[PDB]
Design a binder for this molecule. Sequence first.
Ligand SMILES: NC(=O)c1ccc[n+]([C@@H]2O[C@H](COP(=O)([O-])OP(=O)(O)OC[C@H]3O[C@@H](n4cnc5c(N)ncnc54)[C@H](OP(=O)(O)O)[C@@H]3O)[C@@H](O)[C@H]2O)c1
Ligand SMILES: N[C@@H](CCC(=O)O)C(=O)O
Length: 419
Amino acid sequence: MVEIDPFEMAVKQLERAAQYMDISEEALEWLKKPMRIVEVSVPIEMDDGSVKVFTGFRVQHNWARGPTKGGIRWHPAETLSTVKALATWMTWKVAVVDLPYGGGKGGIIVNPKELSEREQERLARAYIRAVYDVIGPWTDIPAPDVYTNPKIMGWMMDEYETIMRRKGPAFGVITGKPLSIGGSLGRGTATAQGAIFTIREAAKALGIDLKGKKIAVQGYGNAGYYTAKLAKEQLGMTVVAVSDSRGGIYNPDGLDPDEVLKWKREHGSVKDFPGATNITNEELLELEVDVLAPAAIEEVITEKNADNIKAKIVAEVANGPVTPEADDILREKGILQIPDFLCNAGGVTVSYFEWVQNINGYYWTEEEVREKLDKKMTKAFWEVYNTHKDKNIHMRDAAYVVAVSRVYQAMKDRGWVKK
Ligand SMILES: NC(=O)c1ccc[n+]([C@@H]2O[C@H](COP(=O)([O-])OP(=O)(O)OC[C@H]3O[C@@H](n4cnc5c(N)ncnc54)[C@H](OP(=O)(O)O)[C@@H]3O)[C@@H](O)[C@H]2O)c1
Ligand SMILES: N[C@@H](CCC(=O)O)C(=O)O
């Protein structure tokens, strides 16, 4: 259902942004192709006793800066191109906030809503058994993503530890784990906290007081719900509309995120929430708000609605929710955009913190994680902002100049590319 191919779009963005920097042709060709792709068959036993084979992908795009990092997406509409694009974005995501990581991603073409608990556990364990040879605490560190949660992360960690015979830091093979089995404090609200920090910095740059303003959030998952909650709590914002895959609810007077979450859990969706009006995702994206945070499937803003966006700041919590064309239209409209791999870099940052805690065997507190995350996100955002201001270019491009250059430097320090 995607407007354009995700990997093609990602490559187009990379070229469009490399047009504003000095990079050799060979380095560009290296960066336009994932470094390793592994397609595996994942066989599991269903509840009725039959054996079903799913398709799994583990794509690492580059590991010049360090071990690759990226979540695992469970999605019926997933394609290898989507995983390649996500790994490519992961690379820039970890480069922009200066982490010793490369870019990676994983996925399974499956509808998890049609799978039971035992089937989900079997699927996670079989995926680990399939991709064990390309993952590790120093090779490839998976994490939670769309339709995956810390539960599945703990199952995957247990399977990896069983295969690995407890020879090294198995806890560090995967992030977003439960706190009991080597989890990190603040990882649950990581991406939301990073998005909130970036929104606050953007408002500071734009000279806008966020108290009493309006935020519309698309998607009510681990990122969308926590983003709405933190915006209502920390920034003093008024959440006027939320949504999920079945539709959204809008309220001019504001919504309480906890009640909406309870209604969603007790009914399966946020639709027909009391005191709110049912709308579509297309209608929510077009609402008159001060901040719009897409936290759902990619490619939600295209030439079919780019001119209808009326938000002062668009916080791309999701991975690649805006097309380059739509980026040009929004920039022509004077709308500030927080780039996708900079806005939601808080999640990968706290995942890096969890990995450090796991490999060192020493765990931090909430305050330390909160301070380090704030420091990293503020530095990265201000670097990207000053970059886009000095060169008079789009935000997305500027972050690329901040990110790709670092990656480029790594290759020149490894001898991968001579020029
Ligand atoms: N997961 C992470 O740790 C993390 C960290 C940083 C960034 N991100 C990015 O943020 C995005 C959201 O991830 P997540 O962890 O929030 O996923 P999630 O919590 O597992 O679920 C995503 C939510 O979005 C809704 N949704 C799914 N498809 C949609 C569509 N086509 N239109 C509108 N809404 C839709 C779903 O509603 P239903 O409940 O009705 O299905 C679901 O509640 C992802 O694209 C991811 O790349 C994720
Ligand atoms: N934004 C990344 C971060 C995941 C991680 O912690 O590695 C994703 O979920 O795709």
